[PDB]
Design a protein around this ligand. Structure first.
Ligand SMILES: [Ca+2]
Ligand SMILES: [Ca+2]
Ligand SMILES: [Ca+2]
Length: 272
DNA sequence: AGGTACCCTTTAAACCTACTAACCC
DNA sequence: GGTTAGTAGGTTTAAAGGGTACCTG
């Protein structure tokens, strides 16, 4: 387990949070995903050797670091292998807060305000706790290895196969392999950077999310990539089945209609 | 006051199709 | 002509993102 894959992953799916209740303040960071990939959590768990997994919620598993003193291992990991997403801003923010706690400054009705001003500029914002602290606040704060991208893709990627309805092809259809990786429109910073990292691939706008889409000859490049740094999780069946199509469709086998049958079969049994 | 854990709710991620364009020429 | 590609439209869940209560101090 490479130490960048972790950041690459946490950049894509981690969740640094500040909660407030009745005022009790506690910091959490958790990765939440489909139960089928509990083992990936377990891989990560054992890697940091801290935190815990449980069933939040249905057909899912959450993993969480909620002890103060275990969060330090995390924070220590993330400074040396910093993060590239706007999530960064959430860490810096999450981290400052952990400072305040490190000193016990948050037992003061004052520290308590220094923390909400942070919380207010976190993932979503102040909710019911807008009128409690209507004194406002705030001020939120280049790919790194390629193990980052393996991590980033293995969580925020999609390896799918395309059966177009070309009325022109003798089969009446086109097999094509696209690779996708979606992210918020606010991360234009990162998406544009994904393109330059490979010097190829399409950037597209949709529903306020952007997609980095990636020509066979390029499709093959990144195929080579995930030999050098592969995907991890259940999601690497989809890669392999995709990868498989990349062979049985790369010796002119995707043009015979005995083969398209074969492809759909493969495709049919992937993603779902 | 710090754990530790049973829950929850929407939405940004993943996943789909089907037509145009610009390609081997 | 036949194959590619770049595009427009989609659907749906697995995330992206939250809570508060319970022991033990
Ligand atoms: Ca994400
Ligand atoms: Ca994922
Ligand atoms: Ca470039």
């Amino acid at each position: 387990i490479n130490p960048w894959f972790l950041t690459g992953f946490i950049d894509g799916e981690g969740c640094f949070r500040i909660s407030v209740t009745k005022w009790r303040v506690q910091l959490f960071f958790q990765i939440n995903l489909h139960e089928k990939d509990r083992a990936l959590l377990e891989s990560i768990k054992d890697y940091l050797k801290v935190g815990k997994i449980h069933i939040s919620g249905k057909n899912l598993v959450q993993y969480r670091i909620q002890t103060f003193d275990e969060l330090t291992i995390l924070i220590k990991h993330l400074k040396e292998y910093p993060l590239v997403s706007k999530k960064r801003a959430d860490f810096e923010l999450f981290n400052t807060a952990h400072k305040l706690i490190k000193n016990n400054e948050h037992l003061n009705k004052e520290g308590i305000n220094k923390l909400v001003s942070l919380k207010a500029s976190l993932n979503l914002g102040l909710s019911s706790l807008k009128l409690a602290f209507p004194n406002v606040i705030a001020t939120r704060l280049n790919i790194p290895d390629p193990h980052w991208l393996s991590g980033f893709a293995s969580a925020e990627g999609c390896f799918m196969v395309g059966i177009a309805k070309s009325s022109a092809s003798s089969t009446g259809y086109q097999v094509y392999l696209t690779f996708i990786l979606t992210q918020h429109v606010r991360d234009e910073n990162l998406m544009k950077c994904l393109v330059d990292y490979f010097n190829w691939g399409r950037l597209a706008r949709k529903r306020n999310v952007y997609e980095y889409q990636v020509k066979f000859s390029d499709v093959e490049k990144l195929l080579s990539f995930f030999d050098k740094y592969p995907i991890l999780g259940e999601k690497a069946k989809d890669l392999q089945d995709f990868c498989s199509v990349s062979d049985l469709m790369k010796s002119k086998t995707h043009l015979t209609e005995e083969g398209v049958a074969k492809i759909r079969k493969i495709k049919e049994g992937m993603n779902r």
